[PDB]
Amino acid sequence: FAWKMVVLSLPRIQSQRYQVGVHYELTEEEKFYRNALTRMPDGPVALEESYSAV
Amino acid sequence: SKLPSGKNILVFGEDGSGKTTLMTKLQGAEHGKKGRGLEYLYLSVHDEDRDDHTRCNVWILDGDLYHKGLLKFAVSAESLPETLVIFVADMSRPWTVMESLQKWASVLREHIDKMKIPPEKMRELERKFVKDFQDYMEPLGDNVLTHNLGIPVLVVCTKCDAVSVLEKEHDYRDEHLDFIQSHLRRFCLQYGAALIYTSVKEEKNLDLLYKYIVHKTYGFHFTTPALVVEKDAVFIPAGWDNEKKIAILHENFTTVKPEDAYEDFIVKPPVRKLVHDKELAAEDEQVFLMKQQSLLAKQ
Numbered sequence: 001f002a003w004k005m006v007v008l009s010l011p012r013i014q015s016q017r018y019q020v021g022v023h024y025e026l027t028e029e030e031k032f033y034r035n036a037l038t039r040m041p042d043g044p045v046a047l048e049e050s051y052s053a054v
Numbered sequence: 055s056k057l058p059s060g061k062n063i064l065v066f067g068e069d070g071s072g073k074t075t076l077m078t079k080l081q082g083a084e085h086g087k088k089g090r091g092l093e094y095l096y097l098s099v100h101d102e103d104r105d106d107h108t109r110c111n112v113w114i115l116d117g118d119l120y121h122k123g124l125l126k127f128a129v130s131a132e133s134l135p136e137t138l139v140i141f142v143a144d145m146s147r148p149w150t151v152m153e154s155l156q157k158w159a160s161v162l163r164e165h166i167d168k169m170k171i172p173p174e175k176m177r178e179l180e181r182k183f184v185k186d187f188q189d190y191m192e193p194l195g196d197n198v199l200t201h202n203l204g205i206p207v208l209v210v211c212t213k214c215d216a217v218s219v220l221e222k223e224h225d226y227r228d229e230h231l232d233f234i235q236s237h238l239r240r241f242c243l244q245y246g247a248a249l250i251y252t253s254v255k256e257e258k259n260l261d262l263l264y265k266y267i268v269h270k271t272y273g274f275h276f277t278t279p280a281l282v283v284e285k286d287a288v289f290i291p292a293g294w295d296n297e298k299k300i301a302i303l304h305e306n307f308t309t310v311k312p313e314d315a316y317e318d319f320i321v322k323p324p325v326r327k328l329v330h331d332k333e334l335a336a337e338d339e340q341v342f343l344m345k346q347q348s349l350l351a352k353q
Contacts, residue, residue, distance in 0.1 A: 001089040008090060024326075028070070034090065038120055047091060051127050 007036055060136050061110040061271040062129055063097065066158040067142030068150075069117035072212055072254070076142070077112055079254055080264055090116055092124050099268055110271060117154070122161055131169040134205060135179055138271050141209045141247070145234065146216040149322035152237055155209065159201070159245065166203060179204030187246055190293020192279050197297070199246045206270050206292070207247045209238065210263065214253035214286045224323075231285060232303050233310050233319055239300045242290065251288040258287050266291070 010033050028034050040046060067073050077095055078086025086095075095112035113128035115121065129137050141158060143151040166176075180202050187199060220226040242249055250266060252259045262278060269276045270292075281289040304312045310319050 001087070004090070037091070044120060044123055047121075048123060048127075051092070051124065054127075 008032065008034060057101070057104070057106050057108045057272060058136075059108055059110075060133065061108070062133050062137035063110060063112040063267070064129060064137055064139040065112065065114040065142060066139070066154075066162075067117060067212075068144065068154050071117070071142055071144035071146075073114050073142050076212060076252070076254060077114060079260060080267075081112070091121055092116070092128060097267065099272065101274075108272065110267075119157075119161075122165070125161075125165050126168075131171060134166075134171075134176075137205055138267065139203075139205065139207045141207065142212060143209060143238070144212045146213040146219070147322075148220060148234055149317075149320050151211075151234065152241055152316065155238075155241060162203065163201075176204045183246060187293045190291070192294070195243075195297050197240075198243055201245050203245075207245060208266075208270070209242060209247045209249055211238070211249065211251050211288075212253075213255075214251045214258055215255040216253075217286055229306060229308065229310060230320070232306055235285075235288070236300060236303050236312060237316055239290070239295060239303075243295055243297070243300065246292065248292045249288060249290040251286060253286065256286070259289065262289065 012031055012033060037044070037047065065073050065077065074086045074088045074093060077093075078084070081095060081097055083095075093112075093114035093116075095114070097110040097112055099108045099110050100106065101108075115124065115128065139162070141155055143155060145151055183202060183204055183206065184194070184199060186206075188194070217231075220230070238249065241247065248266070250259050250263050252263055254260065265274070265276070265278070268274045276291075278289065280291065280294045281287055301312075
């Protein structure tokens with residue numbers, strides 16, 4: 001679990017960050033790259049291959 | 055004769071519903087970090103009579119259909135009869151609770167056909183679960199246990215401290231609560247499931263949940279009867295309910311019908327649209343200055 005938090009806890013790029021006042025909180029998907037597993041180029045089988053060794 | 059081990063816990067729910075923070079307080083750990091994909095944990099189950107300690111592993115699945123292929127490592131074919139399934143529903147967003155239930159049920163139904171179990175073993179398991187349902191103490195019906203899996207299942211409702219936010223800034227009444235509890239009682243009756251209402255902010259039925267897992271996974275003695283009056287601490291175990299214990303909730307229905315669908319009465323609130331598609335698109339220069347050439351010629 002610690003090796004995947006290096007990428008998965010990276011802060012996302014915020015476009016309109018200069019505005020202030022709106023008291024909404026962005027979710028975890030739009031604050032950090034929590035959809036990086038869906039962008040896996042070989043499909044989810046690399047995560048299956050990673051879990052297979054445990 | 056030592057106590058059996060290898061008892062499996064299968065947690066299913068949407069992401070952000072608070073499954074990890076529920077499991078770290080059921081187990082007793084301080085910081086349960088929400089690792090994504092699958093989470094691995096075990097339950098500290100022990101008895102004071104035989105002085106024996108049993109390890110019962112916990113498998114948590116995140117709310118993502120892209121990770122539905124991870125279930126092969128969580129449960130196998132041989133680990134199926136030693137698996138107790140907890141289905142997690144979060145009524146903090148009460149508009150989409152049994153949707154997650156039926157989609158995880160369909161996922162479990164297609165996944166239980168993936169290893170191609172022979173028709174004798176799961177029929178024996180279904181017969182065992184049917185006789186365990188019929189022998190509860192404090193043929194079947196038309197819609198009772200019609201979608202049985204053969205293994206003990208459970209539906210646990212989370213954030214019971216989040217009942218007041220439903221009433222105050224959404225203008226909910228007791229008919230609102232009765233409508234959502236009737237549908238899940240129908241689901242529990244259809245699937246042979248139980249219901250424990252639990253809040254971790256208000257610390258309600260957490261040890262009652264823990265004793266229920268210990269009893270349903272190890273045959274421990276159970277004495278707590280069904281609770282229906284306390285709407286924040288509802289306890290409906292397996293075998294208590296029937297087609298007439300759901301009909302008592304239809305008396306307070308003055309504007310809604312029990313036979314109606316779900317999404318017609320309770321609607322999810324519309325949310326903020328990404329209002330940025332107004333954009334700015336300056337024209338191509340060629341057509342723009344042909345138009346300006348026409349304006350040059352016409353005047």
